Design a protein around this ligand. Structure first.
Ligand SMILES: [Zn+2]
Lengths: 63, 46
């Protein structure tokens, strides 16, 4: 909870999940998953998307 | 002929010219090996 011009913006993260590693969206591909043996040979990171549900609310009402 | 390349997972002989996106033209897997052709290399048996 912090202060705007005499309102009170309130955030909270309700839930956060990590997806298993896929290709980026828009990629024309057949097997959408990414396996570790690709990421060793191409020298990239084996990484999964993190995303959460933030709950913005001004002056106490969940909006 | 153009230089044959081989995909890592579905094994299709893709002929990558120098001006295209590199990808396999069946599945789309990005790591692509290179095909060994006929040429003479001399190794000693020692
Ligand atoms: Zn392929």
């Amino acid at each position: 909870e912090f202060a705007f011009k005499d309102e009170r913006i309130s955030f909270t993260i309700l839930d956060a999940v990590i997806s298993p590693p896929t290709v980026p969206k828009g990629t024309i591909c057949k097997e959408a998953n990414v396996y570790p043996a690709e990421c060793r040979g191409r020298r990239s990171t084996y990484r999964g998307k993190l995303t959460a549900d933030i709950n913005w609310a001004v002056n106490g009402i969940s909006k | 002929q153009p230089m044959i390349y081989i995909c890592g997972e579905c094994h299709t002989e893709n002929e990558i010219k120098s001006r295209d996106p590199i990808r396999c033209r069946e599945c789309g897997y990005r790591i692509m090996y290179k095909k060994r052709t006929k040429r003479l290399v001399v190794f000693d048996a020692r």
